[PDB]
Amino acid sequence: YFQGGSGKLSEQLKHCNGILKELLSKKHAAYAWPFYKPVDASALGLHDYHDIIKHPMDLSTVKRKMENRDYRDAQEFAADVRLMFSNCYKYNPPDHDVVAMARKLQDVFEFRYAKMPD
Amino acid sequence: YFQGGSGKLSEQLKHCNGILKELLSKKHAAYAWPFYKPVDASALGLHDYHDIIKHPMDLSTVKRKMENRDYRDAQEFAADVRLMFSNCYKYNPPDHDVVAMARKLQDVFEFRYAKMPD
Ligand SMILES: CCS(=O)(=O)Nc1ccc(Oc2ccc(F)cc2F)c(-c2cn(C)c(=O)c3cc(-c4cnc[nH]4)oc23)c1
Ligand SMILES: CCS(=O)(=O)Nc1ccc(Oc2ccc(F)cc2F)c(-c2cn(C)c(=O)c3cc(-c4cnc[nH]4)oc23)c1
Ligand SMILES: [K+]
Secondary structure (H helix, E strand, C coil): CCCCCCCCCCHHHHHHHHHHHHHHCHHHHHHHHHHCCCCCHHHHCCCCHHHHCCCCCCHHHHHHHHHCCCCCCHHHHHHHHHHHHHHHHHHCCCCCHHHHHHHHHHHHHHHHHCCCCC | CCCCCCCCCCHHHHHHHHHHHHHHCHHHHHHHHHHCCCCCHHHHCCCCHHHHCCCCCCHHHHHHHHHCCCCCCHHHHHHHHHHHHHHHHHHCCCCCHHHHHHHHHHHHHHHHHCCCCC
16 A cells, blocks of 8 residues: 555666566466466465465565565575475475476576576 | 684574585585586686686585585575576586586475475
8 A cells, every 4th residue: 555666677687577577478387377376275275385384485476576676686586486496395295296397497497597697 | 814603503504504415425426526616617628607607606615604604594505505506507508417417406405495494
């Protein structure tokens, strides 16, 4: 209900915003879709999720934070994206399909984040 | 020449120290060894390395920083380990052997880092 953030993004944050658009794009939808919204622990029957995962994260939350101008630098953006993957790796056994998807999405993220303009 | 850091590690930093020890252990030496010391750009003939990579990182530097009590929290430790991998992904073509090694080492890192006590 207070004013939302707005302003130009820094050069490094434009790079991050580009990454975000790519992670949300049709290019990666086959493996990105489980990360499009918060994990709905109630609907999926994951009654231990919120006991194991203290800081839930997903791409819709990253998108709202970018649009709101919450991120002040690239490191802060990267930390949220990585948190989203870490949560998946913490909660799930390593042979789960959703873990395979997370690893693929993370390869996309890591390879492009590494090309940060200096 | 001034005093080195010393002090107890927080619980989360003990977890990070444990990860560090594992990354330096014989368990992972077949793919960790290129990260044991800074990239010696002179010796390897990589005369563009320091133009592309602004913040070099390697496991010996992470080790000295942990021993010196440089890291104040787990996120700071993770940022350096991840930076080491990112540098590798930035500099090298994605089919290079050293990239394959980096990905394997990063999988070891990410899966264990995700089990952060909290
Ligand atoms: C769009 C978010 S949502 O509204 O909560 N819907 C949703 C739907 C399916 C999910 O998981 C799967 C994805 C692909 C797959 F092959 C199997 C899944 F269980 C998941 C899912 C996402 N993540 C990030 C997870 O870590 C887990 C774990 C589980 C899970 C379901 N049953 C056991 N574990 O489901 C998800 C989520
Ligand atoms: C222990 C650090 S060191 O003293 O500088 N020695 C060292 C030795 C070999 C290295 O790279 C390779 C490792 C395995 C392999 F199969 C091929 C390599 F080129 C590398 C190496 C490490 N990293 C992190 C890199 O990104 C690259 C890139 C290259 C490289 C060499 N020739 C073209 N690219 O070598 C390294 C380093
Ligand atoms: K990070």
